[PDB]
Amino acid sequence: KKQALLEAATQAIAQSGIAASTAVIARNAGVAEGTLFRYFATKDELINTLYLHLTHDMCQSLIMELDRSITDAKMMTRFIWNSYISWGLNHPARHRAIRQLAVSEKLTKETRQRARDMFPELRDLCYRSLLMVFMSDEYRAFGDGLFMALAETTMDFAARDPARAGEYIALGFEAMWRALTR
Amino acid sequence: KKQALLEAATQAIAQSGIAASTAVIARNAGVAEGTLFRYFATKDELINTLYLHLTHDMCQSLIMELDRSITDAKMMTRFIWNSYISWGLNHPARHRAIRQLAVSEKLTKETRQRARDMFPELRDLCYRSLLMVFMSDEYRAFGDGLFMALAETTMDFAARDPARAGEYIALGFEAMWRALTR
Numbered sequence: 001k002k003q004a005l006l007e008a009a010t011q012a013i014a015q016s017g018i019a020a021s022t023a024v025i026a027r028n029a030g031v032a033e034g035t036l037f038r039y040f041a042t043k044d045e046l047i048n049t050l051y052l053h054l055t056h057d058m059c060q061s062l063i064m065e066l067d068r069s070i071t072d073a074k075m076m077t078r079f080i081w082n083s084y085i086s087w088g089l090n091h092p093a094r095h096r097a098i099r100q101l102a103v104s105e106k107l108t109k110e111t112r113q114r115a116r117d118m119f120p121e122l123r124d125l126c127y128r129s130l131l132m133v134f135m136s137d138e139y140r141a142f143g144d145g146l147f148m149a150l151a152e153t154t155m156d157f158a159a160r161d162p163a164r165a166g167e168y169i170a171l172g173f174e175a176m177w178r179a180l181t182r
Numbered sequence: 183k184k185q186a187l188l189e190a191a192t193q194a195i196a197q198s199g200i201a202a203s204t205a206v207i208a209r210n211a212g213v214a215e216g217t218l219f220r221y222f223a224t225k226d227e228l229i230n231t232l233y234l235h236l237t238h239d240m241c242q243s244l245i246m247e248l249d250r251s252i253t254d255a256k257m258m259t260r261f262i263w264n265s266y267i268s269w270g271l272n273h274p275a276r277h278r279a280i281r282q283l284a285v286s287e288k289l290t291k292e293t294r295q296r297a298r299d300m301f302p303e304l305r306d307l308c309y310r311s312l313l314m315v316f317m318s319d320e321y322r323a324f325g326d327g328l329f330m331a332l333a334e335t336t337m338d339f340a341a342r343d344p345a346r347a348g349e350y351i352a353l354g355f356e357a358m359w360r361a362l363t364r
């Protein structure tokens with residue numbers, strides 16, 4: 001099924017990178033390799049769709065825990081940071097794959113913009129405090145990559161030192177905030 | 183010699199993480215695991231010695247390129263940033279290996295203290311501008327990991343989009359400077 005292949009592609013891309021074979025992915029999904037291509041016509045297609053599926057999963061937990069009572073930009077961003085830190089901690093495979101898929105040459109401009117416009121409110125809540133350079137078409141991926149690099153580092157230190165996780169998350173957040181916001 | 187094991191360790195920890203087995207390291211170097219254990223009594227000893235050797239290779243490349251006439255603290259830091267990014271693009275396995283080793287649990291803090299004190303002038307150069315949080319005993323490793331996560335993203339984008347390399351290095355540097363310095 002389409003769902004069993006996206007899950008195998010998630011784990012494979014997280015462990016082996018974007019160079020994961022489609023022969024490994026369908027095999028790790030219980031279907032033959034031909035079924036993979038009858039759902040995802042090309043390697044690049046599965047790359048782009050899984051990005052859309054992973055970003056949809058990630059933001060749906062971003063906005064799910066977001067307090068709509070909050071109106072201050074920084075406090076609101078602290079909510080989204082804590083949710084993203086928690087999502088990666090609760091879903092280590094999806095976070096690793098969404099990292100390697102956001103980086104890649106293979107993501108088309110249509111998938112990149114649709115990943116932002118899929119949740120328009122959260123986009124404006126996740127972008128309208130940024131350095132304007134990081135919302136440009138040419139540096140938006142890089143801006144997402146600095147954020148995710150800082151978040152991953154925050155995840156690792158926290159899971160490996162739970163007593164201090166509360167401080168890693170706060171320090172990581174302020175560091176991210178000075179790095180990317182205006 | 184040991185160099186084959188140290189190099190195999192670099193490639194393997196950069197690929198399969200600190201979780202990489204002693205057997206493949208030894209095997210990808212064409213030496214017996216026993217011999218690996220004849221030179222490194224534990225996997226922990228291997229990981230602490232490797233971190234020392236890898237930090238020495240990186241720090242000396244940093245000081246090999248310094249200009250002793252750069253007396254501005256921020257400009258001097260930008261030179262060191264340029265060196266580190268350059269060192270990471272020329273040796274992506276050594277750089278990828280240094281990030282996982284530095285954030286791992288099994289690295290004794292006598293080891294990483296010895297890593298910073300083998301180049302004391304470099305140590306005080308790159309740490310003189312840092313916030314107190316990131317010079318603390320508890321959050322020093324966290325500061326190095328945030329720096330390295332930002333540099334790694336900078337290297338990844340500069341290598342894959344070289345038409346825009348200069349912007350990534352500059353934006354990466356300024357992002358890092360806001361995140362970690364007073």
Ligand SMILES: COc1ccc2c(c1OC)C(=O)O[C@@H]2[C@H]1c2c(cc3c(c2OC)OCO3)CCN1C
Nearest residue numbers: 055077080084115116119122123126143144147180
């Ligand atoms: C609604 O659509 C989106 C919003 C924001 C982002 C992406 C995105 O599309 C899927 C993306 O791919 O990456 C960022 C990045 C990010 C967030 C929140 C931020 C921030 C960020 O990095 C620029 O800067 C300060 O607040 C949320 C989590 N996400 C990893």
Ligand SMILES: COc1ccc2c(c1OC)C(=O)O[C@@H]2[C@H]1c2c(cc3c(c2OC)OCO3)CCN1C
Nearest residue numbers: 237241266297298301304305308309325326329330
């Ligand atoms: C030799 O002595 C050292 C100096 C600086 C650092 C370490 C170190 O020991 C090996 C270290 O392990 O971590 C940092 C980190 C780092 C550098 C340069 C920086 C910086 C850094 O991290 C906070 O911030 C401001 O500029 C250089 C590279 N290195 C990865």
